[PDB]
RNA sequence: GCUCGCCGGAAGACCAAGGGUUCCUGUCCAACGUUAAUCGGGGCAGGGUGAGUCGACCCCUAAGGCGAGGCCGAAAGGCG
């Protein structure tokens, strides 16, 4: 589910933003770390046999973050090329209002593409 | 993995002495191994030795050692 939210600053600018749903996001919170927790080398442990608590109380939910940025783009595939809103390459990256285990709110900025004299 | 051979009062399993991490897991093959090595009792990194009742310490003494005073000896020291 996208819900896409698109507002017009002035004229050529543009602002998107994209919403996540609440529970979606931080339930594979799980399923990006147990493909790194068999390969993290702790000094105590075997090679991933890393018991649970230890890897989630010191970065098991600091590595989300990065995730997150993967996670700002990864509704494009279902913003850019299925909703047609075109921006201008790269645009900014700005995070926004996150809250507990909730939704996910930001923007980003850009001109639109200017037309041509065909 | 399947055959073949060898020891079986030992070439098996433990303990004391002595050694002092050689034990186990991951990784590496320059040097060390009388050859090659991906392997090792090798290099590097992390783990591993839980006792009222087993041993030490402890109580008691043998050979013997030391020995308050003491006797003896130029000094050191000898015997007790």
């Given at each position: 589910?996208?819900?896409?939210?698109?507002?017009?600053?002035?004229?050529?600018?543009?602002?998107?933003?994209?919403?996540?749903?609440?529970?979606?996001?931080?339930?594979?919170?799980?399923?990006?770390?147990?493909?790194?927790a068999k390969k993290?080398?702790?000094?105590?442990?075997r090679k991933g046999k890393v018991?649970?608590?230890?890897?989630?109380?010191?970065?098991?939910?600091?590595?989300?973050?990065?995730?997150?940025?993967?996670?700002?783009?990864?509704?494009?595939?279902?913003?850019?090329?299925?909703?047609?809103?075109?921006?201008?390459?790269?645009?900014?990256?700005?995070?926004?209002?996150?809250?507990?285990?909730?939704?996910?709110?930001?923007?980003?900025?850009?001109?639109?593409?200017?037309?041509?004299?065909?």
């Amino acid at each position: 589910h996208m819900q896409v939210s698109v507002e017009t600053t002035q004229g050529l600018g543009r602002r998107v933003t994209i919403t996540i749903a609440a529970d979606s996001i931080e339930t594979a919170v799980k399923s990006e770390l147990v493909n790194v927790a068999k390969k993290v080398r702790i000094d105590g442990f075997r090679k991933g046999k890393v018991p649970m608590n230890i890897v989630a109380q010191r970065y098991g939910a600091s590595v989300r973050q990065d995730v997150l940025g993967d996670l700002m783009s990864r509704n494009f595939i279902d913003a850019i090329i299925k909703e047609k809103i075109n921006p201008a390459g790269a645009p900014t990256y700005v995070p926004g209002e996150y809250k507990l285990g909730e939704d996910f709110t930001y923007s980003v900025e850009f001109e639109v593409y200017p037309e041509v004299e065909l």
